[PDB]
């Protein structure tokens, strides 16, 4: 009837898209990059060791001042750190201890958290009576929250394990836009620097490009063989990198709509939990399940350095906005700052 | 020194925060955390009602011991993405009804309900995050098994059964089939109880099993066992 015809049309369209992608490729990234200077040796020393968490640390986010940091752990407590002096600014208890994500507002006024309780909680950091209160509880997701990122003080974007991304209005507590199209649990979110686009990575081994104000997908990116666990834009917003369980990081191109570079080693068989880019985009930092982080040359696909020093799985990375330091969180309840 | 007055005050505030975190540490570590699993609706409601969204937590105190139960029902997602959050639970409570060997899931005929429960038990007991985690097994609805076994033999579920169609032998066979699924016998134990009792004997069982688990945990930490 119509189902077979529609399936045939979809297959033909996919074939046409693949042909258009293939006709676009003329020279690989390695063919252009092979005549630039090597990055060299990257030796980063641990400058701080933030202690106080009593369980696995799952999420961490930097502040826009490159001094304040927020971390979440299974203790049921959110801690705000003064990375310069290791001091703690706040210790926010959580109603649900099963936290898996946290975010720090660009204005520094709010902190969000979420997890297995299906609720995004907004916390008011700057309050007249001195304590940190629960500003808003965002309900509506039927699956666990995996990532959340602030657009401004009134808009937030959340990803959930119900194959759905959402855009929220914090003042009204409603869901302004719902992003659908993923066939698996969505794991990661990353915002473009211009606050106009964002990409998400799900467990269907795929990545999608969204628009905030239109709620529709432009491009779908494939190539991974397992669940994508982390994703991060290039500094200029024209590329992004993903990490998955097949011990390989990709680099994807928005304007070319194609795979650019692959980052893999024969000695790595463990999945990737976190990816982050340096300020210039030359270095790509990836956290792994083998207890350490690898620094990758984003243009030469060559390993430049290793960040060892964690006794358990590295869960979360982060590079400051000025690009001065890298923060690594691990399941051993420790955060480390590197230079 | 080389610190201002405000820097010293901030350091003192951080020290107070550290003290509060440490103080909450012992309170968190002195609670028994239990993870409740179960296929479909076997004994899910009854175990909750004996204490009379997403994750559901139940708090109760029995004999100067505080108990944490986490119910993962209605969490229809991929299990391999949030099952590592319970790597440090004290024990796993598993509920299996006894009166479902004659039933079918009504979506797949070749899947038996007891076979589905066994598949889930095999998947959870042998998980890489639960190598040294004990499991308390609850066998619900034994009066239904009493009144159904006289008209339907157990051979409908197990073609290899070669025993009498009586309650005691069939219950023993079912328990043995469940305990044979454990292939980590050198590092965990499986506690079995028949929970179709109106009396408050299930909480006592849970207390005894948890006491045994903590005793072996302390022995392992000391090095004697």
């Amino acid at each position: 009837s119509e189902l077979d015809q529609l399936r045939q049309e979809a297959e033909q369209l996919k074939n046409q898209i693949r042909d258009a992608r293939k006709a676009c490729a003329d020279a690989t990234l390695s063919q252009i990059t092979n005549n630039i200077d090597p990055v060299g040796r990257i030796q980063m020393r641990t400058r701080r060791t933030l202690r106080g968490h009593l369980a696995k640390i799952y999420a961490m986010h930097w502040g826009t001042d490159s001094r304040l940091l927020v971390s979440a752990s299974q203790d049921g407590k959110l801690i705000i750190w003064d990375s310069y002096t290791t001091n703690k600014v706040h210790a926010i208890p959580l109603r649900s201890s099963w936290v898996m994500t946290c975010a720090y507002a660009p204005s520094g006024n709010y902190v969000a958290c979420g997890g297995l309780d299906n609720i995004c909680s907004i916390y008011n950091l700057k309050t007249r009576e001195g304590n940190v209160r629960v500003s808003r509880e965002l309900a509506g997701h039927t699956g666990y929250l995996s990532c959340c990122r602030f657009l401004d003080d009134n808009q937030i974007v959340t990803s959930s394990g119900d194959t759905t991304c959402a855009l929220w209005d914090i003042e009204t507590g409603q869901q302004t836009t719902t992003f659908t199209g993923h066939t698996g649990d969505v794991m990661s979110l990353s915002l473009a620097p211009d606050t106009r686009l964002f990409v998400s990575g799900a467990c269907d081994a795929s990545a999608k490009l969204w628009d905030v104000r239109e709620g529709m997908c432009r491009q779908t990116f494939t190539g991974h063989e397992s669940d994508i666990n982390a994703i991060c834009f290039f500094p200029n917003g024209n590329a992004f990198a993903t990490g998955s369980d097949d011990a390989t990081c990709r680099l994807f191109d928005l304007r070319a709509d194609q795979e650019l570079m692959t980052y893999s080693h024969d000695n790595i068989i463990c999945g990737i939990t976190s990816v982050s880019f340096s300020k210039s985009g030359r270095l790509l930092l990836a956290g792994y399940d083998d207890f350490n982080c690898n620094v990758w040359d984003a243009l030469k696909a060559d390993r430049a350095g290793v960040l060892a020093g964690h006794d358990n799985r590295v869960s979360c990375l982060g590079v400051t906005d000025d690009g001065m330091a890298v923060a690594t969180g691990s399941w051993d309840s420790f955060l480390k700052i590197w230079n | 020194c080389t610190l201002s007055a405000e820097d010293k005050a901030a350091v003192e505030r951080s020290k107070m925060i550290d003290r509060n975190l440490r103080e909450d540490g012992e309170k968190a570590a002195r609670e028994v955390k239990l993870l409740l699993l179960g296929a479909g609706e076997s004994g899910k409601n009854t175990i909750v009602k004996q204490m009379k969204t997403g994750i559901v937590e139940t708090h109760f105190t029995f004999k100067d011991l505080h108990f944490k139960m986490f119910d993962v029902g209605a969490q229809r997602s991929e299990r391999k993405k949030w099952i590592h959050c319970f790597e440090g639970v004290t024990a796993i409570i598993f509920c299996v009804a006894l009166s479902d060997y004659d039933l079918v899931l009504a979506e797949d005929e070749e899947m038996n309900r007891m076979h589905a429960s066994m598949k889930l038990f095999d998947s959870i007991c042998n998980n890489k995050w639960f190598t040294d985690t004990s499991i308390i097994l609850f066998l619900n609805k034994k009066d239904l098994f009493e009144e159904k076994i006289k008209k339907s033999p157990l051979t409908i579920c197990y073609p290899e059964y070669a025993g009498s169609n009586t309650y005691e032998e069939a219950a023993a066979y079912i328990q043995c089939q469940f305990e044979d699924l454990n292939k980590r016998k050198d590092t965990k134990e499986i506690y079995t109880h028949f929970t179709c009792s109106t009396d408050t004997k299930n909480v006592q069982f849970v207390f005894d099993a948890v006491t045994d688990v903590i005793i072996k945990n302390n022995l392992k930490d000391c090095g004697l066992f």
Partner: single-chain antibody
Amino acid sequence: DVQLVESGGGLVQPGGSRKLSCSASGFAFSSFGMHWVRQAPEKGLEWVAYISSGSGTIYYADTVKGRFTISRDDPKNTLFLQMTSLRSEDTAMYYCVRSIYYYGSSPFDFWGQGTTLTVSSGSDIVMTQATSSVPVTPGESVSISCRSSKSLLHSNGNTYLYWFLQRPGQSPQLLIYRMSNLASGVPDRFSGSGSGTAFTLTISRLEAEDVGVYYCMQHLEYPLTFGAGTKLEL
């Protein structure tokens, strides 16, 4: 709302003892450090004591050591100042100041209504305000200067200087907390600038609501010192 209502004032014979109570309502009293600041009828602010959160650090002024005791009651949300061997120079208007300390905090942000107590008849930093009275027509910019005998530019990059405004018949309020940062609830027309030992406060587009006495205070090292105060008239 945030309130700090004081009690315990009156007329006191010399050598007596009276206790001042500072009742708190509307904020987390346990997480806030507390101060006592007094003002004599000669129109001059003067620091007295300070008790931190957790009652771990206690500081006294040099003129009250051995005579005054400061204590707090966190469950009852009350602050006590135990005063003994009172002299005629202790006649002032004792205020209760609320302060909190972390990165980017706004200390000295709320003040109590104060209480009146009447007694019958070296290395400290000097903050001086040369101008004592600046008559000016409303609607024009006003500059107020306050210089220091010691540099307030600490090695961490922060300059610890504060600006306060006291309207007639009211309690002092915060305007600038570290030389550049505007307080919460005050208009953007107030601006602070300076470097080293010279500090200025600019009030562009002056209105009649800003008429009062302006004080400058440092928080570099205890004891905290105020200025004489510049009064804006007309």
